[PDB]
Amino acid sequence: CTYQPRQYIAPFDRQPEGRVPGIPQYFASTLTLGGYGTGVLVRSNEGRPTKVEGNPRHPASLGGTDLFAQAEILTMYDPDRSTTVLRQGVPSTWAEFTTTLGNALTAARATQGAGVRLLTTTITSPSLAAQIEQFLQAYPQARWYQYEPINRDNVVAGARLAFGRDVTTRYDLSAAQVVVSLDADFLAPGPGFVAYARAFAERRKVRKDSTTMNRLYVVEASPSTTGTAADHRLPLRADAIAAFTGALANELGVGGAPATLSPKAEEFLRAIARDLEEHRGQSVVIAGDQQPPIVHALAHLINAELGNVGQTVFYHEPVEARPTNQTEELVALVSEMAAGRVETLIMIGGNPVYNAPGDLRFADRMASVPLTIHLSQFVDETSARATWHIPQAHPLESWGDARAFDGTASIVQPLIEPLYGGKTANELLAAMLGQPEAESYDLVRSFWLEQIGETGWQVALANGVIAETVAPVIEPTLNEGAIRATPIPQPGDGVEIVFRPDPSLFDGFYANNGWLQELPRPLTKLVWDNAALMSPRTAIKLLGLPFNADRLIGTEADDRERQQYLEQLSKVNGTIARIEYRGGIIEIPIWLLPGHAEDSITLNLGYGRTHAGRVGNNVGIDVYPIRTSDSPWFGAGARVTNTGRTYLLVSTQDHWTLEGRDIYRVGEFKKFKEDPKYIAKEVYQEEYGRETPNYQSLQPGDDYTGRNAWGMTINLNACIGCNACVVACQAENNIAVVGKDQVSRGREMHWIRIDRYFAGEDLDNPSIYMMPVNCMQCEKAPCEVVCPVAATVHDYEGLNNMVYNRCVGTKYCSNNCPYKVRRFNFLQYSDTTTETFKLAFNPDVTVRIRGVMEKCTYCVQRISGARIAAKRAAVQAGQSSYVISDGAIQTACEQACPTGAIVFGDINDSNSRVAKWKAEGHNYGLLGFLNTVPRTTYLARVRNPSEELEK
Amino acid sequence: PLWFKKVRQNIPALLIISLIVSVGMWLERYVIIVISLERDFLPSSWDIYIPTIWDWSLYIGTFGLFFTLLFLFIRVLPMINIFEMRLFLYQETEKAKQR
């Protein structure tokens, strides 16, 4: 027998010119979530994409990335991606499709293209738009008919009501001291999310020198990440927001309508109005895409009155190709299909049968159409019912161009030749235009050349942006008469339904991706499932649950009793409620959301897919059939009867409150300005009777005075609970995806977790607190002392070292870890039989086997690479300095965060950002009564409350 | 009940109390370990322990191994020390002589 197998090695036959073996490279490419491009820098280990990061020179992606961009790596390596062209579910060839397409188009040339119809999503690519325009020029009677489930129809409708022209609204949150959000999530993933998050967070971050902080007021039906980072939040019903906006305009004096409202809503209106007019040109009003067009028109009118336009709100020429009402265009197409006028339908992605509203009955009308061609990148439900399904190249493996919300014209660059082939959207358009076998690289290059030039093309590929292209600033004219003469529909028709895009699955495109499905949803902590979300009071009345719901309300004296009652109120989660909206019954299990508005239910789209891959093949209940074209984001009447039949719903946290413990510290800004250490000086007076706790240790530790020391500071004020960092850690450290059954047994493997504590008076309108938790790298570590084989030992720098090979699996270390951040491989979670998943795994980090513990390693692979590089540079110079720069090492979570809450740097170097942050008066370490001395510390949250609403 | 002499003398009473004590000691270990581990310093890391069938199978299997070893011991080797019992008789007879 021998120590190991032969381990043959296969080299190249011709070396790549610019590649040094074993050295990863970085390439600039663009990833689009809503059709709006976001610049990304992606690591190519050996010619294969492995890690997506942000492009510092790209507007809307300055280092930070959203979770959807991070989790694109596993999507590109899904073992369920389409591999061949299917005629009617039978494999075929691209040449046969090209011949058929040509014959069908020359058969439609007798007419002007009256049968030929298109169906794409929000297209912002200049190349595709130009090709589509040329195709429409060739066939005069063809139509484009864009549609996608999550669209900006209300925004353009409000723009065409306020200015009589489609404009692009941009918000400069850096110069806005007061921000008001009418059911708008600007801190949730969407157009311009990273840029808005970074600017908003920078103002919130407060030091002893800082004298000013921004204030956010948010009115919304469902609690959200934007709501979490708000000084004041009002849970108004979704329909009532339009009336609230009209009342706000009336008290400001701008055209509107007085609306009857609850006293709490009236007090909120008085505070918002009083804060405005005190910050003219220093305020912005943001209206959500879900809200009706009148709300958008009023928001433009309010901004103009306060003079905010040109200072905080900027108008630009439309960036989304031809802006249009997508839902109306789909309704026009379905009527034509029912009539039978359409003879050819070509769809570039968008999963229309599943995505389209139930009332439309797109699938039944799709059968009438003789030929329907779909390019999806997967065999989706639409592709199954469509002839001539064609595989679509993934953005990572395709040549393409995209435009950002500001307007950037960034270029998508392939990192690998397509694994299963497949054709890009531009290549499909070329075949329709009469040029078959046209390369994607030539099509994009030919359009860009002579517009930016060959030299511009070279600069554009090297950077992530095209400097020449940007949206021009325009000054539109506000039509007072049109905005004033609007119905402003009144709320109230019985129980209402709110439709919201899923935080992790978006529109359901990412349902196949394992990382996103396993990710705990922010504010509900649910995994692998969809549940109706309702306030505790709503559940008691509609489902007849036997609880008072007024017991939760109370003062600080009975807070512990009310927290226990909330735990008793839980355990009713998972009861199935049959909900009838407009002839449709969902039968969905219910999960209690404390912050939710009364008489309102939130249903998340993106679940119940039937033709998705083996992961998420049948997860959750589809909400698309109940959804209607007339009212896409809102509902009027729901029966919500209780059928009992409770169904298990799996959540990671399992507890919704802090039990009277100092885990999260919250303080006012005015007191903070007088003394930064006031929050820390307090608490210790209640617990020990003295301002400073005199903790005493019997264990020496190590000096660490003259050596690099690695520490992390997380800012509570900055964090919005996006969960991008959790996805970034999973991609970087090759963390396994456990099944729903393993999560049910509490065996989920996540190095970084975000905890929502929901701690407040009343508990029916609680203040959500999101805290990111990762290994604290404690200088004196309890886990190390209890390890029999010495698998866990400290490091010269101060990093805790977990060696998987040494670990025998005793599990004593997890028991002695106070923060419970250690995850154990109880079963063989890692995938060994899937070739595509094996390609995805990063070479720098080992793939753990069953029986070994795992914990956050401060991205040791990055630290080791920097240490080796610094030593190599010093010896070549002869200095022997071994100096590491402050920005040289950035952890995957630090790069991913859009807000910038996580900072990683040397602690000893007093000029480093972490050293300056750790010298702040509100910095503290969790569970100080245990002499662990953590290196990962937190900055206590500082709020900015208005004296009107608060006092 | 053990405090009273009559209960200690009764053989059935001793057997019932001994079985109850054996179950109670198992429950004491359960309380010390599992309950303490279930809830800790951070409320977010709170979960319930529910034993499966396989750990119970191991428990009955260990009982079976224990009783198998006992039965082979009593079959092959003497249960009562043959010497130190006749020496006990010698000591008792000598005590009677010295009254």
Ligand code: SF4
């Ligand atoms: S946080 Fe837990 S695992 Fe990390 S060093 Fe401290 S005790 Fe060990």
Ligand code: SF4
């Ligand atoms: S430092 Fe690295 S390993 Fe630790 S939580 Fe962040 S990404 Fe994960």
Ligand code: SF4
């Ligand atoms: S710390 Fe994580 S969850 Fe919080 S804002 Fe940053 S990326 Fe999002």
Ligand code: F3S
């Ligand atoms: S106690 Fe030690 S043996 Fe492994 S499971 Fe923990 S590092």
